[PDB]
Each structure stands twice: as structure tokens, then as C-alpha cells.
Short mmCIF file of all heavy atoms in Angstrom, two decimals:
data_model
loop_
_atom_site.label_atom_id
_atom_site.label_comp_id
_atom_site.label_asym_id
_atom_site.label_seq_id
_atom_site.Cartn_x
_atom_site.Cartn_y
_atom_site.Cartn_z
N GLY A 1 -13.92 36.25 -51.60
CA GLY A 1 -15.13 36.32 -50.87
C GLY A 1 -15.26 37.55 -49.96
O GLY A 1 -16.44 37.93 -49.68
N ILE A 2 -14.22 38.08 -49.46
CA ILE A 2 -14.29 39.21 -48.68
C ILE A 2 -14.57 40.49 -49.50
O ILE A 2 -15.38 41.29 -49.30
CB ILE A 2 -12.92 39.43 -47.87
CG1 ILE A 2 -12.82 38.34 -46.77
CG2 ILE A 2 -12.99 40.80 -47.21
CD1 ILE A 2 -11.46 38.27 -46.16
N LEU A 3 -13.80 40.57 -50.70
CA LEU A 3 -13.97 41.65 -51.55
C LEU A 3 -15.32 41.74 -52.20
O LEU A 3 -15.72 42.82 -52.70
CB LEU A 3 -12.86 41.82 -52.63
CG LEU A 3 -11.47 42.04 -51.96
CD1 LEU A 3 -10.42 41.91 -53.04
CD2 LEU A 3 -11.44 43.45 -51.41
N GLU A 4 -16.00 40.58 -52.54
CA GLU A 4 -17.41 40.62 -52.97
C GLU A 4 -18.35 41.11 -51.93
O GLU A 4 -19.41 41.80 -52.35
CB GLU A 4 -17.82 39.27 -53.51
CG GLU A 4 -17.02 38.89 -54.78
CD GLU A 4 -17.39 37.46 -55.19
OE1 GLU A 4 -18.07 36.74 -54.49
OE2 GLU A 4 -17.07 37.06 -56.28
N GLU A 5 -18.18 40.91 -50.73
CA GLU A 5 -19.11 41.34 -49.75
C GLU A 5 -18.85 42.81 -49.34
O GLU A 5 -19.66 43.44 -48.69
CB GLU A 5 -18.95 40.59 -48.43
CG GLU A 5 -19.48 39.13 -48.66
CD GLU A 5 -19.46 38.30 -47.36
OE1 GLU A 5 -18.83 38.77 -46.40
OE2 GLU A 5 -19.97 37.15 -47.32
N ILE A 6 -17.65 43.38 -49.76
CA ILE A 6 -17.41 44.75 -49.58
C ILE A 6 -18.18 45.60 -50.68
O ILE A 6 -18.52 46.72 -50.45
CB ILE A 6 -15.96 45.03 -49.48
CG1 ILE A 6 -15.40 44.35 -48.26
CG2 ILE A 6 -15.60 46.57 -49.43
CD1 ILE A 6 -13.85 44.43 -48.23
N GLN A 7 -18.24 45.04 -51.93
CA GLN A 7 -18.97 45.63 -52.95
C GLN A 7 -20.46 45.79 -52.69
O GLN A 7 -21.08 46.72 -53.06
CB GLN A 7 -18.71 44.98 -54.32
CG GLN A 7 -17.40 45.24 -54.90
CD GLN A 7 -17.27 44.66 -56.34
OE1 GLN A 7 -18.01 43.66 -56.56
NE2 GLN A 7 -16.58 45.21 -57.13
N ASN A 8 -21.04 44.69 -52.20
CA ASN A 8 -22.46 44.90 -51.74
C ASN A 8 -22.67 45.93 -50.65
O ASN A 8 -23.65 46.58 -50.75
CB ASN A 8 -22.97 43.52 -51.23
CG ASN A 8 -23.08 42.49 -52.28
OD1 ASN A 8 -23.10 42.73 -53.44
ND2 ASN A 8 -22.90 41.27 -51.98
N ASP A 9 -21.85 46.18 -49.78
CA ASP A 9 -21.89 47.02 -48.71
C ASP A 9 -21.82 48.46 -49.22
O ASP A 9 -22.39 49.38 -48.76
CB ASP A 9 -21.01 46.87 -47.56
CG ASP A 9 -21.30 45.60 -46.88
OD1 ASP A 9 -22.31 44.99 -47.02
OD2 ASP A 9 -20.33 45.19 -46.09
N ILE A 10 -20.95 48.75 -50.29
CA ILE A 10 -20.82 50.05 -50.92
C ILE A 10 -22.08 50.34 -51.71
O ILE A 10 -22.25 51.48 -51.98
CB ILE A 10 -19.56 50.11 -51.73
CG1 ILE A 10 -18.33 49.90 -50.81
CG2 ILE A 10 -19.33 51.46 -52.41
CD1 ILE A 10 -17.00 49.63 -51.54
N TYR A 11 -22.72 49.36 -52.15
CA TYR A 11 -23.97 49.57 -52.94
C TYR A 11 -25.05 49.99 -52.03
O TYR A 11 -26.06 50.76 -52.41
CB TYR A 11 -24.29 48.40 -53.78
CG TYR A 11 -25.57 48.41 -54.48
CD1 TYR A 11 -25.64 49.20 -55.67
CD2 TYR A 11 -26.70 47.77 -54.08
CE1 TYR A 11 -26.94 49.34 -56.35
CE2 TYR A 11 -27.90 47.81 -54.73
CZ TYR A 11 -27.99 48.64 -55.80
OH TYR A 11 -29.13 48.71 -56.51
N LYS A 12 -25.05 49.61 -50.82
CA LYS A 12 -26.03 49.96 -49.80
C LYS A 12 -25.79 51.52 -49.43
O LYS A 12 -26.68 52.25 -49.26
CB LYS A 12 -25.93 49.10 -48.47
CG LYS A 12 -26.24 47.68 -48.71
CD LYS A 12 -27.63 47.56 -49.09
CE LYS A 12 -28.64 47.88 -47.90
NZ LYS A 12 -30.05 47.45 -48.16
N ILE A 13 -24.51 51.77 -49.18
CA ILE A 13 -24.22 53.18 -48.78
C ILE A 13 -24.55 54.17 -49.87
O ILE A 13 -24.95 55.35 -49.49
CB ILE A 13 -22.73 53.35 -48.52
CG1 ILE A 13 -22.22 52.50 -47.35
CG2 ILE A 13 -22.27 54.69 -48.13
CD1 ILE A 13 -20.77 52.29 -47.10
N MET A 14 -24.46 53.85 -51.05
CA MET A 14 -24.97 54.76 -52.22
C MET A 14 -26.44 55.06 -52.19
O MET A 14 -26.85 56.11 -52.63
CB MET A 14 -24.55 54.20 -53.62
CG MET A 14 -23.10 54.14 -53.80
SD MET A 14 -22.69 53.38 -55.37
CE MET A 14 -23.29 54.64 -56.56
N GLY A 15 -27.24 54.11 -51.65
CA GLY A 15 -28.61 54.45 -51.44
C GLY A 15 -28.98 55.28 -50.33
O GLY A 15 -29.78 56.26 -50.42
N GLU A 16 -28.30 55.15 -49.15
CA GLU A 16 -28.40 56.03 -48.07
C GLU A 16 -28.13 57.58 -48.41
O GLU A 16 -28.83 58.41 -48.05
CB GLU A 16 -27.52 55.61 -46.83
CG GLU A 16 -27.60 56.54 -45.65
CD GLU A 16 -26.64 56.05 -44.68
OE1 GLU A 16 -25.91 54.95 -44.81
OE2 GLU A 16 -26.53 56.58 -43.48
N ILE A 17 -26.96 57.58 -49.13
CA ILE A 17 -26.53 59.00 -49.37
C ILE A 17 -27.29 59.66 -50.45
O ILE A 17 -27.51 60.86 -50.69
CB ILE A 17 -25.04 59.02 -49.74
CG1 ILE A 17 -24.29 58.65 -48.42
CG2 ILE A 17 -24.53 60.36 -50.27
CD1 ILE A 17 -22.84 58.43 -48.70
N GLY A 18 -27.68 58.79 -51.66
CA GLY A 18 -28.41 59.26 -52.82
C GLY A 18 -29.75 59.81 -52.41
O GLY A 18 -30.24 60.80 -53.02
N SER A 19 -30.51 59.28 -51.45
CA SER A 19 -31.84 59.65 -51.10
C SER A 19 -31.84 60.56 -49.92
O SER A 19 -32.87 60.95 -49.41
CB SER A 19 -32.70 58.43 -50.70
OG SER A 19 -32.14 57.80 -49.53
N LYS A 20 -30.66 61.14 -49.61
CA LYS A 20 -30.63 62.05 -48.36
C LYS A 20 -31.22 61.41 -47.08
O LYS A 20 -31.79 62.19 -46.23
CB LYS A 20 -31.22 63.43 -48.61
CG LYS A 20 -30.49 64.20 -49.76
CD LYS A 20 -31.20 65.39 -50.04
CE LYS A 20 -30.47 66.24 -51.11
NZ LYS A 20 -31.35 67.44 -51.44
N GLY A 21 -31.02 60.13 -46.88
CA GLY A 21 -31.43 59.48 -45.66
C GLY A 21 -32.73 58.84 -45.71
O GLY A 21 -32.96 58.03 -44.66
N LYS A 22 -33.58 59.03 -46.68
CA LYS A 22 -34.97 58.53 -46.58
C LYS A 22 -34.95 57.03 -46.83
O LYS A 22 -36.03 56.28 -46.67
CB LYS A 22 -35.83 59.21 -47.79
CG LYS A 22 -36.09 60.63 -47.49
CD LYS A 22 -36.92 61.29 -48.64
CE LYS A 22 -37.20 62.69 -48.24
NZ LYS A 22 -37.90 63.30 -49.35
N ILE A 23 -33.84 56.48 -47.18
CA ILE A 23 -33.66 54.87 -47.32
C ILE A 23 -32.77 54.54 -46.17
O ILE A 23 -31.83 55.28 -45.81
CB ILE A 23 -33.28 54.59 -48.65
CG1 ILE A 23 -34.27 55.02 -49.67
CG2 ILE A 23 -33.08 53.05 -48.82
CD1 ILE A 23 -33.71 54.94 -51.11
N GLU A 24 -32.96 53.25 -45.77
CA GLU A 24 -31.98 52.75 -44.66
C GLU A 24 -30.62 52.42 -45.33
O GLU A 24 -30.62 51.74 -46.45
CB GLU A 24 -32.61 51.51 -44.10
CG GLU A 24 -31.63 50.99 -42.94
CD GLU A 24 -32.30 49.85 -42.26
OE1 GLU A 24 -33.40 49.38 -42.55
OE2 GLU A 24 -31.57 49.28 -41.24
N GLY A 25 -29.69 52.83 -44.73
CA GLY A 25 -28.28 52.47 -45.19
C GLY A 25 -27.87 51.25 -44.57
O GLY A 25 -28.77 50.39 -44.32
N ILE A 26 -26.54 50.99 -44.37
CA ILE A 26 -26.11 49.76 -43.68
C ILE A 26 -26.48 49.82 -42.27
O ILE A 26 -26.68 50.78 -41.57
CB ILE A 26 -24.60 49.60 -43.88
CG1 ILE A 26 -23.78 50.80 -43.37
CG2 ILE A 26 -24.23 49.32 -45.34
CD1 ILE A 26 -22.37 50.57 -43.34
N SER A 27 -26.68 48.60 -41.69
CA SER A 27 -26.95 48.45 -40.27
C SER A 27 -25.63 48.62 -39.51
O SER A 27 -24.43 48.64 -40.15
CB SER A 27 -27.54 47.19 -39.90
OG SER A 27 -26.77 46.13 -40.30
N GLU A 28 -25.56 48.53 -38.17
CA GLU A 28 -24.39 48.52 -37.38
C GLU A 28 -23.82 47.02 -37.26
O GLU A 28 -22.71 46.84 -36.66
CB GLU A 28 -24.60 49.10 -36.02
CG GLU A 28 -25.43 48.26 -35.17
CD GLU A 28 -26.97 48.34 -35.42
OE1 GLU A 28 -27.33 49.14 -36.32
OE2 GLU A 28 -27.64 47.76 -34.66
N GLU A 29 -24.65 46.13 -37.70
CA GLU A 29 -24.11 44.77 -37.78
C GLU A 29 -22.94 44.59 -38.73
O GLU A 29 -22.20 43.66 -38.63
CB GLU A 29 -25.29 43.80 -38.07
CG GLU A 29 -24.84 42.29 -38.02
CD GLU A 29 -24.53 41.87 -36.62
OE1 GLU A 29 -24.93 42.50 -35.71
OE2 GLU A 29 -24.05 40.70 -36.53
N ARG A 30 -22.92 45.60 -39.78
CA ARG A 30 -21.79 45.39 -40.73
C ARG A 30 -20.53 46.09 -40.38
O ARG A 30 -19.40 45.50 -40.59
CB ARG A 30 -22.34 46.09 -42.07
CG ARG A 30 -23.56 45.47 -42.50
CD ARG A 30 -23.31 43.99 -42.91
NE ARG A 30 -22.31 43.90 -44.04
CZ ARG A 30 -21.75 42.70 -44.37
NH1 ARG A 30 -22.06 41.58 -43.81
NH2 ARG A 30 -20.86 42.75 -45.36
N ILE A 31 -20.62 47.28 -39.64
CA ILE A 31 -19.35 47.82 -39.12
C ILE A 31 -18.62 46.95 -38.02
O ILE A 31 -17.51 46.99 -37.87
CB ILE A 31 -19.56 49.21 -38.57
CG1 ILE A 31 -20.22 50.09 -39.64
CG2 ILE A 31 -18.37 49.85 -38.10
CD1 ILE A 31 -20.68 51.48 -39.05
N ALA A 32 -19.53 46.07 -37.36
CA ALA A 32 -19.01 45.10 -36.50
C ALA A 32 -18.55 43.92 -37.19
O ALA A 32 -17.78 43.11 -36.56
CB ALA A 32 -20.08 44.68 -35.46
N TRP A 33 -18.80 43.80 -38.54
CA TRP A 33 -18.19 42.74 -39.34
C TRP A 33 -16.71 43.05 -39.86
O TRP A 33 -15.85 42.18 -39.84
CB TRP A 33 -19.10 42.37 -40.52
CG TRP A 33 -18.52 41.40 -41.44
CD1 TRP A 33 -18.51 40.02 -41.30
CD2 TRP A 33 -17.98 41.65 -42.80
NE1 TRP A 33 -17.97 39.40 -42.39
CE2 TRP A 33 -17.56 40.38 -43.30
CE3 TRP A 33 -17.63 42.78 -43.47
CZ2 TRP A 33 -16.92 40.31 -44.49
CZ3 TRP A 33 -17.09 42.69 -44.65
CH2 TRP A 33 -16.71 41.40 -45.20
N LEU A 34 -16.49 44.25 -40.30
CA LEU A 34 -15.08 44.69 -40.62
C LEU A 34 -14.17 44.53 -39.44
O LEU A 34 -13.09 44.02 -39.69
CB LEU A 34 -15.07 46.14 -41.19
CG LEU A 34 -15.75 46.44 -42.50
CD1 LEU A 34 -15.66 47.96 -42.65
CD2 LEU A 34 -15.06 45.74 -43.68
N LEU A 35 -14.63 45.08 -38.34
CA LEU A 35 -13.68 45.02 -37.12
C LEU A 35 -13.47 43.60 -36.72
O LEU A 35 -12.39 43.38 -35.94
CB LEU A 35 -14.42 45.79 -36.04
CG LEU A 35 -14.56 47.22 -36.40
CD1 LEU A 35 -15.33 47.97 -35.41
CD2 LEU A 35 -13.17 48.03 -36.61
N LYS A 36 -14.16 42.60 -37.00
CA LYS A 36 -13.70 41.22 -36.89
C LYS A 36 -12.56 40.86 -37.70
O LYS A 36 -11.64 40.15 -37.30
CB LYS A 36 -14.93 40.22 -37.13
CG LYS A 36 -16.05 40.44 -36.19
CD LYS A 36 -15.84 40.11 -34.77
CE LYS A 36 -17.04 40.30 -33.92
NZ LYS A 36 -16.68 40.17 -32.39
N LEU A 37 -12.54 41.37 -39.00
CA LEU A 37 -11.42 41.00 -39.94
C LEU A 37 -10.23 41.79 -39.53
O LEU A 37 -9.21 41.22 -39.53
CB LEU A 37 -11.91 41.41 -41.33
CG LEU A 37 -13.06 40.60 -41.80
CD1 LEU A 37 -13.46 41.10 -43.22
CD2 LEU A 37 -12.71 39.16 -41.94
N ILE A 38 -10.18 43.10 -39.25
CA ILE A 38 -9.12 43.74 -38.96
C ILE A 38 -8.32 43.21 -37.81
O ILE A 38 -7.17 43.14 -37.86
CB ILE A 38 -9.43 45.40 -38.72
CG1 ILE A 38 -10.07 45.93 -39.87
CG2 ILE A 38 -8.28 46.13 -38.22
CD1 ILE A 38 -10.60 47.28 -39.61
N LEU A 39 -9.07 42.70 -36.77
CA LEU A 39 -8.31 42.19 -35.52
C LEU A 39 -7.81 40.78 -35.98
O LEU A 39 -6.89 40.26 -35.15
CB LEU A 39 -9.30 42.01 -34.41
CG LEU A 39 -9.79 43.29 -33.76
CD1 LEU A 39 -10.79 43.04 -32.67
CD2 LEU A 39 -8.64 44.03 -33.15
N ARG A 40 -8.25 40.12 -37.01
CA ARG A 40 -7.78 38.79 -37.43
C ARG A 40 -6.50 38.93 -38.20
O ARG A 40 -5.54 38.14 -38.03
CB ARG A 40 -8.90 38.09 -38.31
CG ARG A 40 -8.44 36.72 -38.86
CD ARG A 40 -9.76 36.14 -39.43
NE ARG A 40 -9.34 34.78 -40.09
CZ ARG A 40 -9.08 34.66 -41.31
NH1 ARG A 40 -9.07 35.76 -42.15
NH2 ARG A 40 -8.85 33.48 -41.86
N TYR A 41 -6.41 39.84 -39.19
CA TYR A 41 -5.25 40.00 -39.97
C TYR A 41 -4.24 40.84 -39.29
O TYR A 41 -2.93 40.64 -39.50
CB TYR A 41 -5.63 40.74 -41.31
CG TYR A 41 -6.39 39.91 -42.18
CD1 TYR A 41 -7.36 40.34 -42.87
CD2 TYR A 41 -6.01 38.54 -42.37
CE1 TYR A 41 -8.20 39.62 -43.82
CE2 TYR A 41 -6.73 37.70 -43.28
CZ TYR A 41 -7.82 38.21 -43.93
OH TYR A 41 -8.45 37.44 -44.84
N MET A 42 -4.48 41.72 -38.44
CA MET A 42 -3.56 42.66 -37.69
C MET A 42 -2.57 41.78 -36.94
O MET A 42 -1.60 42.13 -36.60
CB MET A 42 -4.37 43.53 -36.74
CG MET A 42 -3.45 44.65 -36.19
SD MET A 42 -4.32 45.83 -35.31
CE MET A 42 -4.90 46.78 -36.74
N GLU A 43 -2.92 40.42 -36.62
CA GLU A 43 -1.96 39.54 -36.11
C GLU A 43 -0.97 38.93 -37.10
O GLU A 43 0.27 38.91 -36.77
CB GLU A 43 -2.66 38.38 -35.30
CG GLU A 43 -3.59 38.89 -34.17
CD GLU A 43 -4.36 37.76 -33.59
OE1 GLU A 43 -4.30 36.65 -34.12
OE2 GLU A 43 -5.02 37.93 -32.51
N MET A 44 -1.39 38.62 -38.36
CA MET A 44 -0.54 38.00 -39.32
C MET A 44 0.43 39.10 -39.68
O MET A 44 1.67 38.72 -39.98
CB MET A 44 -1.36 37.58 -40.49
CG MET A 44 -2.29 36.45 -40.25
SD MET A 44 -3.40 36.08 -41.76
CE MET A 44 -4.31 34.75 -41.03
N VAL A 45 -0.02 40.34 -39.91
CA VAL A 45 0.91 41.31 -40.41
C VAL A 45 1.87 41.79 -39.18
O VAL A 45 1.33 42.26 -38.20
CB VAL A 45 0.15 42.55 -41.02
CG1 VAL A 45 1.06 43.59 -41.34
CG2 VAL A 45 -0.59 42.03 -42.17
N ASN A 46 3.13 41.66 -39.39
CA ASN A 46 4.15 42.15 -38.46
C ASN A 46 4.53 43.52 -39.00
O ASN A 46 5.24 43.62 -39.91
CB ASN A 46 5.20 41.27 -38.35
CG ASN A 46 4.86 39.94 -37.56
OD1 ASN A 46 3.89 39.98 -36.78
ND2 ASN A 46 5.61 38.79 -37.79
N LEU A 47 4.13 44.60 -38.28
CA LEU A 47 4.33 45.95 -38.76
C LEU A 47 5.83 46.23 -38.74
O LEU A 47 6.68 45.58 -38.14
CB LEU A 47 3.65 46.98 -37.81
CG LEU A 47 3.76 48.42 -38.28
CD1 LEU A 47 3.11 48.63 -39.57
CD2 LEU A 47 3.18 49.35 -37.16
#
């Protein structure tokens, strides 16, 4: 379920870059979504 929501977000980025910005890319609400996950797994993983 995580990797399916990452494919939708890469499909948004391809529109921002393909149109040279004339289309809205991802919001900042999404970059705040990855950082919730990194801080959740970074505890499970013992480096």
C-alpha cells in the first residue's frame, strides 16, 4: 500500500516537469507524508 502511493506521486511529478511548470506538481503535503514514514521505520532498523 505504500509502494502504490509512491507510483501515484511519481506520476504527478512527470506532469510538473513535462509541462515546464505550467501544471501543478505535488503539494508539500506529500513531502510531509514521506517524512512521517522515514521517522517510523528508522526506529525498527538498527543501523
Side-chain angles (χ1 to χ4, degrees):
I2 292 170
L3 293 173
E4 290 178 349
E5 293 180 351
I6 295 171
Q7 285 182 331
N8 291 337
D9 295 347
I10 298 170
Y11 175 76
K12 299 294 285 186
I13 298 171
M14 292 177 70
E16 177 183 1
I17 293 172
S19 66
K20 294 177 181 178
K22 294 178 179 179
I23 300 171
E24 182 178 2
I26 58 172
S27 63
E28 71 281 3
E29 184 69 15
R30 301 297 296 170
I31 301 170
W33 176 81
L34 291 175
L35 298 170
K36 300 297 183 182
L37 296 175
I38 296 171
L39 294 174
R40 178 173 178 268
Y41 291 138
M42 188 173 284
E43 295 176 351
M44 296 176 183
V45 174
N46 289 335
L47 182 62

